[PDB]
Amino acid sequence: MVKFLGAVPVLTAVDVPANVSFWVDTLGFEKDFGDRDFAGVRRGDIRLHISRTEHQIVADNTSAWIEVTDPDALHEEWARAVSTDYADTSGPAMTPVGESPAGREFAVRDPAGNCVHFTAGE
Amino acid sequence: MVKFLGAVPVLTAVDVPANVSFWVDTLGFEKDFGDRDFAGVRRGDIRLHISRTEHQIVADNTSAWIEVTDPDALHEEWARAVSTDYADTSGPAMTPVGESPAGREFAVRDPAGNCVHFTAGE
Ligand SMILES: [Cl-]
Ligand SMILES: [Cl-]
Ligand SMILES: [Cu+2]
Ligand SMILES: [Cu+2]
């Protein structure tokens, strides 16, 4: 029997080291490995990879979902360092907490353009 | 403290129903929900989301990593249903299994263009 053990989303970025710095320095993730072409970050029990792309439109259309135990707590933590004006696309930003078919959630748009959703999970 | 429980890659497709069918009908995943705009499939406890995109170039550069206990067995299971001619882009296909920077793995390119890597985990 083959068992499925875990999954790793891949964000894309035209400038990978700049996007890794956001996830690590501002959002508190840990860098696992990485160079200008491909990098991995991690936090808690989850991992994210970041792969270089030549096309900005790919990054502006990439997303991922992460389940966390307390999205409101997480949102208040990051609201100290990330803009809450999501409409302003001149930097990264985060949405308010809202409802989704999956439950409470908010999203972060990172400086590369990826949209990562942080949703309730138990 | 906030805990990070799981992560869900998002594959993209111009035709979501067709890509969902590959994953469910050909690769044996289960369908959790889905319409023409967004869908969710699952195997074991790992999940993948599939989001519609209007631009093929996004699907052609989207990717995901899934960890499994035995990539060689999994490749053999899927060899009677997925082409092994990776270079023929008229349909989905998969690579040979071999060592890579990520560990022993193979990849599948699904009909929508996404590349999903199946790697040995622990
Ligand atoms: Cl969205
Ligand atoms: Cl690749
Ligand atoms: Cu959007
Ligand atoms: Cu490639």
Side-chain angles (χ1 to χ4, degrees), chain A residues 2-8 10 43 45-47 63 65-69 121, chain B residues 3-8 10 38 43 46-47 49 63 65-69 122:
Chain A
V2 180
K3 302 182 59 145
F4 285 59
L5 296 178
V8 187
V10 177
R43 182 141 170 196
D45 273 352
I46 66 97
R47 281 180 290 156
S63 57
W65 260 260
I66 299 308
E67 299 176 321
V68 302
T69 44
Chain B
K3 279 22 194 288
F4 287 71
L5 299 180
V8 184
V10 175
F38 198 88
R43 177 138 169 194
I46 77 128
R47 286 181 295 120
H49 289 341
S63 66
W65 264 257
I66 291 310
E67 280 163 345
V68 298
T69 48
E122 249 213 349

PDB file of all heavy atoms in Angstrom, chain A residues 2-8 10 43 45-47 63 65-69 121, chain B residues 3-8 10 38 43 46-47 49 63 65-69 122:
ATOM      1  N   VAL A   2       0.438   2.204  -0.859  1.00  0.00           N
ATOM      2  CA  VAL A   2       1.132   3.489  -0.787  1.00  0.00           C
ATOM      3  C   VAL A   2       0.330   4.435   0.107  1.00  0.00           C
ATOM      4  O   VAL A   2      -0.853   4.660  -0.139  1.00  0.00           O
ATOM      5  CB  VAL A   2       1.297   4.128  -2.176  1.00  0.00           C
ATOM      6  CG1 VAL A   2       2.008   5.444  -2.004  1.00  0.00           C
ATOM      7  CG2 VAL A   2       2.057   3.119  -3.032  1.00  0.00           C
ATOM      8  N   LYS A   3       0.998   5.009   1.103  1.00  0.00           N
ATOM      9  CA  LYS A   3       0.266   5.998   1.861  1.00  0.00           C
ATOM     10  C   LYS A   3       0.685   7.426   1.476  1.00  0.00           C
ATOM     11  O   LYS A   3       1.880   7.631   1.243  1.00  0.00           O
ATOM     12  CB  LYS A   3       0.538   5.793   3.351  1.00  0.00           C
ATOM     13  CG  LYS A   3       0.133   4.381   3.776  1.00  0.00           C
ATOM     14  CD  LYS A   3       0.380   4.226   5.265  1.00  0.00           C
ATOM     15  CE  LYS A   3      -0.407   5.238   6.080  1.00  0.00           C
ATOM     16  NZ  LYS A   3      -0.911   4.740   7.395  1.00  0.00           N
ATOM     17  N   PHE A   4      -0.280   8.345   1.464  1.00  0.00           N
ATOM     18  CA  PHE A   4      -0.029   9.752   1.178  1.00  0.00           C
ATOM     19  C   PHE A   4       0.284  10.464   2.461  1.00  0.00           C
ATOM     20  O   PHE A   4      -0.589  10.508   3.349  1.00  0.00           O
ATOM     21  CB  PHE A   4      -1.218  10.379   0.417  1.00  0.00           C
ATOM     22  CG  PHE A   4      -1.262   9.946  -1.054  1.00  0.00           C
ATOM     23  CD1 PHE A   4      -1.357   8.607  -1.408  1.00  0.00           C
ATOM     24  CD2 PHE A   4      -1.234  10.868  -2.080  1.00  0.00           C
ATOM     25  CE1 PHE A   4      -1.404   8.199  -2.741  1.00  0.00           C
ATOM     26  CE2 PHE A   4      -1.239  10.512  -3.409  1.00  0.00           C
ATOM     27  CZ  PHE A   4      -1.335   9.171  -3.736  1.00  0.00           C
ATOM     28  N   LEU A   5       1.458  11.043   2.635  1.00  0.00           N
ATOM     29  CA  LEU A   5       1.855  11.584   3.903  1.00  0.00           C
ATOM     30  C   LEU A   5       1.686  13.061   4.133  1.00  0.00           C
ATOM     31  O   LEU A   5       1.562  13.517   5.278  1.00  0.00           O
ATOM     32  CB  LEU A   5       3.366  11.327   4.152  1.00  0.00           C
ATOM     33  CG  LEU A   5       3.723   9.830   4.269  1.00  0.00           C
ATOM     34  CD1 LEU A   5       5.231   9.706   4.470  1.00  0.00           C
ATOM     35  CD2 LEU A   5       2.886   9.145   5.342  1.00  0.00           C
ATOM     36  N   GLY A   6       1.755  13.852   3.085  1.00  0.00           N
ATOM     37  CA  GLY A   6       1.713  15.311   3.391  1.00  0.00           C
ATOM     38  C   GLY A   6       1.855  15.992   1.995  1.00  0.00           C
ATOM     39  O   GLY A   6       2.095  15.343   0.983  1.00  0.00           O
ATOM     40  N   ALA A   7       1.598  17.306   1.978  1.00  0.00           N
ATOM     41  CA  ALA A   7       1.624  18.094   0.768  1.00  0.00           C
ATOM     42  C   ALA A   7       2.318  19.419   1.042  1.00  0.00           C
ATOM     43  O   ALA A   7       2.226  19.995   2.143  1.00  0.00           O
ATOM     44  CB  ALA A   7       0.184  18.365   0.357  1.00  0.00           C
ATOM     45  N   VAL A   8       2.957  19.955   0.035  1.00  0.00           N
ATOM     46  CA  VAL A   8       3.700  21.197   0.109  1.00  0.00           C
ATOM     47  C   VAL A   8       3.246  22.080  -1.072  1.00  0.00           C
ATOM     48  O   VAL A   8       3.525  21.710  -2.250  1.00  0.00           O
ATOM     49  CB  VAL A   8       5.240  20.989  -0.028  1.00  0.00           C
ATOM     50  CG1 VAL A   8       5.920  22.304   0.245  1.00  0.00           C
ATOM     51  CG2 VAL A   8       5.759  19.933   0.953  1.00  0.00           C
ATOM     52  N   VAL A  10       3.358  25.215  -3.686  1.00  0.00           N
ATOM     53  CA  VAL A  10       4.517  25.954  -4.213  1.00  0.00           C
ATOM     54  C   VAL A  10       4.080  27.356  -4.548  1.00  0.00           C
ATOM     55  O   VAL A  10       3.250  27.511  -5.444  1.00  0.00           O
ATOM     56  CB  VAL A  10       5.030  25.243  -5.486  1.00  0.00           C
ATOM     57  CG1 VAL A  10       6.189  26.018  -6.090  1.00  0.00           C
ATOM     58  CG2 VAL A  10       5.485  23.848  -5.243  1.00  0.00           C
ATOM     59  N   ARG A  43       6.915  26.599   9.040  1.00  0.00           N
ATOM     60  CA  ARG A  43       6.401  27.072  10.312  1.00  0.00           C
ATOM     61  C   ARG A  43       5.503  26.010  10.970  1.00  0.00           C
ATOM     62  O   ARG A  43       4.630  25.525  10.256  1.00  0.00           O
ATOM     63  CB  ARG A  43       5.575  28.360  10.215  1.00  0.00           C
ATOM     64  CG  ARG A  43       5.134  28.787  11.632  1.00  0.00           C
ATOM     65  CD  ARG A  43       5.228  30.311  11.713  1.00  0.00           C
ATOM     66  NE  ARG A  43       4.602  30.799  12.951  1.00  0.00           N
ATOM     67  CZ  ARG A  43       4.238  32.031  13.223  1.00  0.00           C
ATOM     68  NH1 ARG A  43       4.375  33.095  12.424  1.00  0.00           N
ATOM     69  NH2 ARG A  43       3.688  32.266  14.413  1.00  0.00           N
ATOM     70  N   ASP A  45       3.916  22.739  11.736  1.00  0.00           N
ATOM     71  CA  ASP A  45       3.948  21.481  11.022  1.00  0.00           C
ATOM     72  C   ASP A  45       3.856  21.649   9.505  1.00  0.00           C
ATOM     73  O   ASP A  45       3.684  20.637   8.797  1.00  0.00           O
ATOM     74  CB  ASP A  45       2.735  20.696  11.541  1.00  0.00           C
ATOM     75  CG  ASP A  45       3.039  19.897  12.815  1.00  0.00           C
ATOM     76  OD1 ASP A  45       4.206  19.791  13.269  1.00  0.00           O
ATOM     77  OD2 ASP A  45       2.037  19.411  13.360  1.00  0.00           O
ATOM     78  N   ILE A  46       3.899  22.889   8.988  1.00  0.00           N
ATOM     79  CA  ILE A  46       3.700  22.980   7.525  1.00  0.00           C
ATOM     80  C   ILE A  46       4.923  23.556   6.858  1.00  0.00           C
ATOM     81  O   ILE A  46       5.787  24.203   7.448  1.00  0.00           O
ATOM     82  CB  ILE A  46       2.463  23.829   7.181  1.00  0.00           C
ATOM     83  CG1 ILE A  46       2.524  25.312   7.534  1.00  0.00           C
ATOM     84  CG2 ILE A  46       1.203  23.263   7.835  1.00  0.00           C
ATOM     85  CD1 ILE A  46       2.931  26.217   6.395  1.00  0.00           C
ATOM     86  N   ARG A  47       5.011  23.338   5.528  1.00  0.00           N
ATOM     87  CA  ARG A  47       6.101  23.805   4.686  1.00  0.00           C
ATOM     88  C   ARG A  47       5.543  24.460   3.414  1.00  0.00           C
ATOM     89  O   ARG A  47       4.491  24.039   2.968  1.00  0.00           O
ATOM     90  CB  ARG A  47       6.920  22.597   4.205  1.00  0.00           C
ATOM     91  CG  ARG A  47       7.856  22.120   5.321  1.00  0.00           C
ATOM     92  CD  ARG A  47       8.663  20.917   4.815  1.00  0.00           C
ATOM     93  NE  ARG A  47       7.695  19.836   4.709  1.00  0.00           N
ATOM     94  CZ  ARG A  47       7.760  18.766   3.939  1.00  0.00           C
ATOM     95  NH1 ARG A  47       8.782  18.576   3.126  1.00  0.00           N
ATOM     96  NH2 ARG A  47       6.741  17.920   4.027  1.00  0.00           N
ATOM     97  N   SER A  63      -1.906  30.563  -5.611  1.00  0.00           N
ATOM     98  CA  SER A  63      -2.418  30.687  -4.233  1.00  0.00           C
ATOM     99  C   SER A  63      -2.193  29.411  -3.441  1.00  0.00           C
ATOM    100  O   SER A  63      -1.712  28.378  -3.969  1.00  0.00           O
ATOM    101  CB  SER A  63      -3.919  30.997  -4.320  1.00  0.00           C
ATOM    102  OG  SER A  63      -4.619  29.992  -5.047  1.00  0.00           O
ATOM    103  N   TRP A  65      -3.623  27.246   0.436  1.00  0.00           N
ATOM    104  CA  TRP A  65      -4.440  27.284   1.666  1.00  0.00           C
ATOM    105  C   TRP A  65      -3.643  26.687   2.812  1.00  0.00           C
ATOM    106  O   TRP A  65      -2.985  25.659   2.655  1.00  0.00           O
ATOM    107  CB  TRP A  65      -5.714  26.468   1.466  1.00  0.00           C
ATOM    108  CG  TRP A  65      -6.894  27.358   1.163  1.00  0.00           C
ATOM    109  CD1 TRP A  65      -7.865  27.744   2.113  1.00  0.00           C
ATOM    110  CD2 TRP A  65      -7.255  27.937  -0.044  1.00  0.00           C
ATOM    111  NE1 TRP A  65      -8.790  28.537   1.503  1.00  0.00           N
ATOM    112  CE2 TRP A  65      -8.431  28.670   0.175  1.00  0.00           C
ATOM    113  CE3 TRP A  65      -6.715  27.918  -1.303  1.00  0.00           C
ATOM    114  CZ2 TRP A  65      -9.095  29.397  -0.809  1.00  0.00           C
ATOM    115  CZ3 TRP A  65      -7.370  28.640  -2.291  1.00  0.00           C
ATOM    116  CH2 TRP A  65      -8.537  29.367  -2.061  1.00  0.00           C
ATOM    117  N   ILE A  66      -3.694  27.286   3.995  1.00  0.00           N
ATOM    118  CA  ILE A  66      -3.010  26.738   5.183  1.00  0.00           C
ATOM    119  C   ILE A  66      -4.040  26.621   6.309  1.00  0.00           C
ATOM    120  O   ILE A  66      -4.777  27.623   6.533  1.00  0.00           O
ATOM    121  CB  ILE A  66      -1.847  27.658   5.593  1.00  0.00           C
ATOM    122  CG1 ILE A  66      -0.746  27.835   4.529  1.00  0.00           C
ATOM    123  CG2 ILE A  66      -1.222  27.174   6.901  1.00  0.00           C
ATOM    124  CD1 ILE A  66      -0.192  26.545   3.981  1.00  0.00           C
ATOM    125  N   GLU A  67      -4.140  25.501   7.007  1.00  0.00           N
ATOM    126  CA  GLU A  67      -5.096  25.420   8.145  1.00  0.00           C
ATOM    127  C   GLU A  67      -4.382  25.776   9.430  1.00  0.00           C
ATOM    128  O   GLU A  67      -3.274  25.302   9.661  1.00  0.00           O
ATOM    129  CB  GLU A  67      -5.729  24.018   8.193  1.00  0.00           C
ATOM    130  CG  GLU A  67      -6.474  23.808   6.882  1.00  0.00           C
ATOM    131  CD  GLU A  67      -7.084  22.445   6.727  1.00  0.00           C
ATOM    132  OE1 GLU A  67      -6.483  21.417   7.116  1.00  0.00           O
ATOM    133  OE2 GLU A  67      -8.197  22.448   6.163  1.00  0.00           O
ATOM    134  N   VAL A  68      -4.987  26.634  10.256  1.00  0.00           N
ATOM    135  CA  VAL A  68      -4.353  27.068  11.491  1.00  0.00           C
ATOM    136  C   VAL A  68      -5.442  27.005  12.594  1.00  0.00           C
ATOM    137  O   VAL A  68      -6.636  26.972  12.317  1.00  0.00           O
ATOM    138  CB  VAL A  68      -3.782  28.483  11.482  1.00  0.00           C
ATOM    139  CG1 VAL A  68      -2.736  28.671  10.368  1.00  0.00           C
ATOM    140  CG2 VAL A  68      -4.927  29.495  11.276  1.00  0.00           C
ATOM    141  N   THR A  69      -4.992  26.972  13.860  1.00  0.00           N
ATOM    142  CA  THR A  69      -6.010  26.716  14.886  1.00  0.00           C
ATOM    143  C   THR A  69      -6.786  27.973  15.225  1.00  0.00           C
ATOM    144  O   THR A  69      -7.877  27.824  15.785  1.00  0.00           O
ATOM    145  CB  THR A  69      -5.365  26.245  16.194  1.00  0.00           C
ATOM    146  OG1 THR A  69      -4.246  27.088  16.433  1.00  0.00           O
ATOM    147  CG2 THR A  69      -4.777  24.848  16.081  1.00  0.00           C
ATOM    148  N   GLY A 121      -9.037  25.317  11.323  1.00  0.00           N
ATOM    149  CA  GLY A 121      -8.897  23.852  11.085  1.00  0.00           C
ATOM    150  C   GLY A 121      -8.839  23.219  12.450  1.00  0.00           C
ATOM    151  O   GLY A 121      -8.568  23.924  13.434  1.00  0.00           O
TER     152      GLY A 121
ATOM    153  N   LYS B   3      -1.231  27.191  16.084  1.00  0.00           N
ATOM    154  CA  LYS B   3      -0.578  26.040  15.487  1.00  0.00           C
ATOM    155  C   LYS B   3      -0.949  25.939  13.997  1.00  0.00           C
ATOM    156  O   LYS B   3      -2.083  26.255  13.622  1.00  0.00           O
ATOM    157  CB  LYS B   3      -1.130  24.779  16.123  1.00  0.00           C
ATOM    158  CG  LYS B   3      -0.675  24.248  17.435  1.00  0.00           C
ATOM    159  CD  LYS B   3      -0.017  25.039  18.486  1.00  0.00           C
ATOM    160  CE  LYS B   3       0.647  24.250  19.589  1.00  0.00           C
ATOM    161  NZ  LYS B   3      -0.130  23.535  20.593  1.00  0.00           N
ATOM    162  N   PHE B   4      -0.066  25.440  13.172  1.00  0.00           N
ATOM    163  CA  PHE B   4      -0.251  25.383  11.708  1.00  0.00           C
ATOM    164  C   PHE B   4      -0.420  23.920  11.390  1.00  0.00           C
ATOM    165  O   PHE B   4       0.598  23.235  11.566  1.00  0.00           O
ATOM    166  CB  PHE B   4       0.956  26.014  11.029  1.00  0.00           C
ATOM    167  CG  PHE B   4       1.073  27.510  11.118  1.00  0.00           C
ATOM    168  CD1 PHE B   4       1.381  28.154  12.302  1.00  0.00           C
ATOM    169  CD2 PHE B   4       0.870  28.305  10.009  1.00  0.00           C
ATOM    170  CE1 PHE B   4       1.501  29.526  12.331  1.00  0.00           C
ATOM    171  CE2 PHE B   4       1.009  29.675  10.020  1.00  0.00           C
ATOM    172  CZ  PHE B   4       1.296  30.327  11.217  1.00  0.00           C
ATOM    173  N   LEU B   5      -1.625  23.507  11.072  1.00  0.00           N
ATOM    174  CA  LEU B   5      -2.035  22.141  11.024  1.00  0.00           C
ATOM    175  C   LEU B   5      -1.809  21.441   9.705  1.00  0.00           C
ATOM    176  O   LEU B   5      -1.560  20.259   9.738  1.00  0.00           O
ATOM    177  CB  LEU B   5      -3.571  22.044  11.270  1.00  0.00           C
ATOM    178  CG  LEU B   5      -3.952  22.599  12.651  1.00  0.00           C
ATOM    179  CD1 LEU B   5      -5.457  22.509  12.892  1.00  0.00           C
ATOM    180  CD2 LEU B   5      -3.215  21.853  13.767  1.00  0.00           C
ATOM    181  N   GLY B   6      -1.949  22.106   8.548  1.00  0.00           N
ATOM    182  CA  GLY B   6      -1.943  21.382   7.254  1.00  0.00           C
ATOM    183  C   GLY B   6      -1.903  22.419   6.164  1.00  0.00           C
ATOM    184  O   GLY B   6      -2.133  23.630   6.351  1.00  0.00           O
ATOM    185  N   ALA B   7      -1.538  21.906   4.983  1.00  0.00           N
ATOM    186  CA  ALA B   7      -1.415  22.889   3.904  1.00  0.00           C
ATOM    187  C   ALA B   7      -2.010  22.267   2.652  1.00  0.00           C
ATOM    188  O   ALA B   7      -1.881  21.035   2.478  1.00  0.00           O
ATOM    189  CB  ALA B   7       0.056  23.226   3.693  1.00  0.00           C
ATOM    190  N   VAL B   8      -2.612  23.081   1.811  1.00  0.00           N
ATOM    191  CA  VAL B   8      -3.369  22.596   0.674  1.00  0.00           C
ATOM    192  C   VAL B   8      -2.888  23.337  -0.584  1.00  0.00           C
ATOM    193  O   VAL B   8      -3.159  24.513  -0.662  1.00  0.00           O
ATOM    194  CB  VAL B   8      -4.874  22.784   0.832  1.00  0.00           C
ATOM    195  CG1 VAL B   8      -5.614  22.150  -0.369  1.00  0.00           C
ATOM    196  CG2 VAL B   8      -5.347  22.160   2.147  1.00  0.00           C
ATOM    197  N   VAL B  10      -2.837  24.495  -4.499  1.00  0.00           N
ATOM    198  CA  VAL B  10      -3.913  24.850  -5.411  1.00  0.00           C
ATOM    199  C   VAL B  10      -3.355  24.665  -6.806  1.00  0.00           C
ATOM    200  O   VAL B  10      -2.434  25.392  -7.181  1.00  0.00           O
ATOM    201  CB  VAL B  10      -4.361  26.320  -5.241  1.00  0.00           C
ATOM    202  CG1 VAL B  10      -5.402  26.712  -6.289  1.00  0.00           C
ATOM    203  CG2 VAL B  10      -4.842  26.445  -3.792  1.00  0.00           C
ATOM    204  N   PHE B  38     -14.115  26.128  -8.909  1.00  0.00           N
ATOM    205  CA  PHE B  38     -13.216  25.723  -7.825  1.00  0.00           C
ATOM    206  C   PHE B  38     -13.600  24.324  -7.391  1.00  0.00           C
ATOM    207  O   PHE B  38     -14.832  24.046  -7.294  1.00  0.00           O
ATOM    208  CB  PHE B  38     -13.328  26.709  -6.687  1.00  0.00           C
ATOM    209  CG  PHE B  38     -12.147  26.629  -5.720  1.00  0.00           C
ATOM    210  CD1 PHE B  38     -11.006  27.391  -5.983  1.00  0.00           C
ATOM    211  CD2 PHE B  38     -12.162  25.847  -4.598  1.00  0.00           C
ATOM    212  CE1 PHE B  38      -9.913  27.307  -5.116  1.00  0.00           C
ATOM    213  CE2 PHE B  38     -11.086  25.775  -3.706  1.00  0.00           C
ATOM    214  CZ  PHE B  38      -9.947  26.549  -3.960  1.00  0.00           C
ATOM    215  N   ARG B  43      -6.870  12.453  -1.167  1.00  0.00           N
ATOM    216  CA  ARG B  43      -6.454  11.035  -1.117  1.00  0.00           C
ATOM    217  C   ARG B  43      -5.820  10.926   0.274  1.00  0.00           C
ATOM    218  O   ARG B  43      -4.919  11.608   0.799  1.00  0.00           O
ATOM    219  CB  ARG B  43      -5.646  10.659  -2.325  1.00  0.00           C
ATOM    220  CG  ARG B  43      -5.137   9.247  -2.310  1.00  0.00           C
ATOM    221  CD  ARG B  43      -5.257   8.547  -3.652  1.00  0.00           C
ATOM    222  NE  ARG B  43      -4.529   7.273  -3.689  1.00  0.00           N
ATOM    223  CZ  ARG B  43      -4.214   6.541  -4.738  1.00  0.00           C
ATOM    224  NH1 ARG B  43      -4.593   6.940  -5.928  1.00  0.00           N
ATOM    225  NH2 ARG B  43      -3.529   5.408  -4.610  1.00  0.00           N
ATOM    226  N   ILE B  46      -4.480  13.740   2.461  1.00  0.00           N
ATOM    227  CA  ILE B  46      -3.941  14.994   1.834  1.00  0.00           C
ATOM    228  C   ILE B  46      -5.019  15.539   0.904  1.00  0.00           C
ATOM    229  O   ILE B  46      -5.777  14.716   0.374  1.00  0.00           O
ATOM    230  CB  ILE B  46      -2.599  14.788   1.107  1.00  0.00           C
ATOM    231  CG1 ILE B  46      -2.700  14.122  -0.236  1.00  0.00           C
ATOM    232  CG2 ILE B  46      -1.610  14.007   1.985  1.00  0.00           C
ATOM    233  CD1 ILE B  46      -2.051  14.786  -1.404  1.00  0.00           C
ATOM    234  N   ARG B  47      -5.113  16.863   0.712  1.00  0.00           N
ATOM    235  CA  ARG B  47      -6.077  17.502  -0.176  1.00  0.00           C
ATOM    236  C   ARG B  47      -5.346  18.320  -1.223  1.00  0.00           C
ATOM    237  O   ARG B  47      -4.240  18.804  -0.987  1.00  0.00           O
ATOM    238  CB  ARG B  47      -6.958  18.429   0.695  1.00  0.00           C
ATOM    239  CG  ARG B  47      -7.846  17.419   1.442  1.00  0.00           C
ATOM    240  CD  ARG B  47      -8.864  17.956   2.377  1.00  0.00           C
ATOM    241  NE  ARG B  47      -8.182  18.633   3.475  1.00  0.00           N
ATOM    242  CZ  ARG B  47      -8.498  19.927   3.593  1.00  0.00           C
ATOM    243  NH1 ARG B  47      -9.371  20.466   2.758  1.00  0.00           N
ATOM    244  NH2 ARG B  47      -7.888  20.554   4.568  1.00  0.00           N
ATOM    245  N   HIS B  49      -6.606  21.574  -3.910  1.00  0.00           N
ATOM    246  CA  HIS B  49      -7.677  22.384  -4.508  1.00  0.00           C
ATOM    247  C   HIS B  49      -7.346  22.603  -5.980  1.00  0.00           C
ATOM    248  O   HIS B  49      -6.159  22.573  -6.358  1.00  0.00           O
ATOM    249  CB  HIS B  49      -7.763  23.774  -3.863  1.00  0.00           C
ATOM    250  CG  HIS B  49      -8.307  23.761  -2.456  1.00  0.00           C
ATOM    251  ND1 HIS B  49      -9.025  22.717  -1.928  1.00  0.00           N
ATOM    252  CD2 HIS B  49      -8.213  24.701  -1.480  1.00  0.00           C
ATOM    253  CE1 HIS B  49      -9.356  23.010  -0.675  1.00  0.00           C
ATOM    254  NE2 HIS B  49      -8.871  24.188  -0.426  1.00  0.00           N
ATOM    255  N   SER B  63       2.727  24.178  -9.730  1.00  0.00           N
ATOM    256  CA  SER B  63       3.306  22.889  -9.287  1.00  0.00           C
ATOM    257  C   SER B  63       2.969  22.617  -7.826  1.00  0.00           C
ATOM    258  O   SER B  63       2.432  23.529  -7.130  1.00  0.00           O
ATOM    259  CB  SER B  63       4.827  22.923  -9.555  1.00  0.00           C
ATOM    260  OG  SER B  63       5.449  23.924  -8.718  1.00  0.00           O
ATOM    261  N   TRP B  65       4.110  19.609  -4.428  1.00  0.00           N
ATOM    262  CA  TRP B  65       4.851  18.398  -3.966  1.00  0.00           C
ATOM    263  C   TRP B  65       3.950  17.558  -3.066  1.00  0.00           C
ATOM    264  O   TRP B  65       3.262  18.098  -2.203  1.00  0.00           O
ATOM    265  CB  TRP B  65       6.171  18.666  -3.221  1.00  0.00           C
ATOM    266  CG  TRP B  65       7.366  18.590  -4.118  1.00  0.00           C
ATOM    267  CD1 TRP B  65       8.266  17.552  -4.205  1.00  0.00           C
ATOM    268  CD2 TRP B  65       7.826  19.554  -5.056  1.00  0.00           C
ATOM    269  NE1 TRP B  65       9.253  17.789  -5.128  1.00  0.00           N
ATOM    270  CE2 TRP B  65       8.993  19.039  -5.670  1.00  0.00           C
ATOM    271  CE3 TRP B  65       7.314  20.799  -5.401  1.00  0.00           C
ATOM    272  CZ2 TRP B  65       9.701  19.717  -6.642  1.00  0.00           C
ATOM    273  CZ3 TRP B  65       8.031  21.485  -6.377  1.00  0.00           C
ATOM    274  CH2 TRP B  65       9.191  20.962  -6.975  1.00  0.00           C
ATOM    275  N   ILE B  66       3.891  16.240  -3.265  1.00  0.00           N
ATOM    276  CA  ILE B  66       3.122  15.433  -2.315  1.00  0.00           C
ATOM    277  C   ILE B  66       4.042  14.381  -1.762  1.00  0.00           C
ATOM    278  O   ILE B  66       4.701  13.771  -2.637  1.00  0.00           O
ATOM    279  CB  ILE B  66       1.957  14.750  -3.062  1.00  0.00           C
ATOM    280  CG1 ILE B  66       0.912  15.762  -3.512  1.00  0.00           C
ATOM    281  CG2 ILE B  66       1.350  13.668  -2.184  1.00  0.00           C
ATOM    282  CD1 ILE B  66       0.418  16.708  -2.469  1.00  0.00           C
ATOM    283  N   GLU B  67       4.097  14.144  -0.474  1.00  0.00           N
ATOM    284  CA  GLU B  67       5.000  13.077   0.033  1.00  0.00           C
ATOM    285  C   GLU B  67       4.259  11.766   0.183  1.00  0.00           C
ATOM    286  O   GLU B  67       3.135  11.808   0.640  1.00  0.00           O
ATOM    287  CB  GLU B  67       5.585  13.545   1.385  1.00  0.00           C
ATOM    288  CG  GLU B  67       6.729  14.517   1.106  1.00  0.00           C
ATOM    289  CD  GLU B  67       7.046  15.318   2.365  1.00  0.00           C
ATOM    290  OE1 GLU B  67       6.184  15.281   3.266  1.00  0.00           O
ATOM    291  OE2 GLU B  67       8.121  15.938   2.339  1.00  0.00           O
ATOM    292  N   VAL B  68       4.878  10.685  -0.254  1.00  0.00           N
ATOM    293  CA  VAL B  68       4.241   9.383  -0.216  1.00  0.00           C
ATOM    294  C   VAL B  68       5.227   8.375   0.382  1.00  0.00           C
ATOM    295  O   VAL B  68       6.421   8.717   0.482  1.00  0.00           O
ATOM    296  CB  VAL B  68       3.815   8.971  -1.639  1.00  0.00           C
ATOM    297  CG1 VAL B  68       2.786   9.979  -2.168  1.00  0.00           C
ATOM    298  CG2 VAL B  68       5.008   8.878  -2.584  1.00  0.00           C
ATOM    299  N   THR B  69       4.777   7.179   0.786  1.00  0.00           N
ATOM    300  CA  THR B  69       5.765   6.238   1.365  1.00  0.00           C
ATOM    301  C   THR B  69       6.627   5.537   0.331  1.00  0.00           C
ATOM    302  O   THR B  69       7.705   5.049   0.618  1.00  0.00           O
ATOM    303  CB  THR B  69       5.026   5.137   2.149  1.00  0.00           C
ATOM    304  OG1 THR B  69       3.967   4.624   1.321  1.00  0.00           O
ATOM    305  CG2 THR B  69       4.335   5.695   3.392  1.00  0.00           C
ATOM    306  N   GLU B 122       8.641  10.642   5.107  1.00  0.00           N
ATOM    307  CA  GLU B 122       8.935   9.836   6.292  1.00  0.00           C
ATOM    308  C   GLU B 122       7.985  10.105   7.452  1.00  0.00           C
ATOM    309  O   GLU B 122       8.423  10.681   8.473  1.00  0.00           O
ATOM    310  CB  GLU B 122      10.391  10.063   6.732  1.00  0.00           C
ATOM    311  CG  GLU B 122      11.256   8.816   6.508  1.00  0.00           C
ATOM    312  CD  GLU B 122      12.347   8.620   7.532  1.00  0.00           C
ATOM    313  OE1 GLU B 122      12.583   9.575   8.319  1.00  0.00           O
ATOM    314  OE2 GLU B 122      12.975   7.513   7.575  1.00  0.00           O
TER     315      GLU B 122
END
